[PDB]
């Protein structure tokens, strides 16, 4: 599949702790090039060149209906999550 437009995302449920040392979130998409792949990244605050988002949901995707569900595991410390143009701070452990 092709990548979604990064400028057409909105938070549906902001990231929260899952209860088993992972992070879960939900987004919505207003583009018409569906279905498409969601771009997901995360970095340690001090090292912005290395992706540390270990995904539990493989290849998150926006279908022809519904939103998107994403779950990831992050290393301890201060991190930043990127989903398209959306962003969120997350402190782990």
């Amino acid at each position: 599949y092709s990548m979604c437009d990064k400028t057409k995302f909105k938070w549906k449920r902001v990231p929260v702790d899952s209860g088993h040392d992972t992070v879960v979130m939900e987004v919505s998409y207003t583009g018409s090039d569906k279905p498409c792949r969601i771009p997901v990244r995360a970095v340690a605050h001090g090292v912005p060149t290395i992706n540390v988002a270990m995904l539990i949901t493989p290849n998150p995707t926006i279908e022809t209906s519904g939103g998107g569900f994403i779950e990831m595991q992050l290393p301890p410390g201060d991190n930043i999550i990127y989903v398209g143009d959306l962003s969120q701070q997350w402190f782990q452990k």
Partner: antibody
Amino acid sequence: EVKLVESEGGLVQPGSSMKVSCTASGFTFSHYYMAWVRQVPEKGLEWVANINYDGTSTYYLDSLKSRFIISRDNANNILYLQMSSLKSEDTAIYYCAREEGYGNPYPYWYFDVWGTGTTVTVSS
Amino acid sequence: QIVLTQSPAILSASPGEKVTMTCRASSSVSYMHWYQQKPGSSPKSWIYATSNLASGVPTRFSGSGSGTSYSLTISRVEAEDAATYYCQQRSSNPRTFGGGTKLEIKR
């Protein structure tokens, strides 16, 4: 939408100083590196400076490192450029710009949003 | 600092035909980026990381290259493509911009 709006420029005498600013809206400002780039008459585009998330690291073009200072105020969504000991060679259009590419090596990074621009003229 | 050579300085083409503009670097780089600028407004991200299209850019555009030679190609030019296009490298400090290629559309 993501938007960057620069302040007013103006005319200044050689050797004097001036401060310009850039106001951001539509995104979480503290989650992006930011930069300044200028367009010089009859020479093209030239990078000036950039700064990390919290302002603890700054980088400059070598021929400008003594005359320019970049800084930011994350709670008020604003980026600054302070100029001093200005020369005539500093007359240009100055653009605010947001960096993108996190999670990849530095050679991958680029400028994904640009400001409207403001003009600074150094003359007697 | 790495010197970037864009050619031609002015590219003139008839509507519907395919065109290619080139950007050569004085030393090797691992990615090249491209920006579009129209008179009276600021530059705009057009292609990033050699071959990825920015949001809103028509799929008639594409980009390619490696090492010391990169390029941007339009499959079928249209009147709204008239503008100046700049290349940029961020592999060596300081980052640098090319001199630009201005695209003219015949009528």
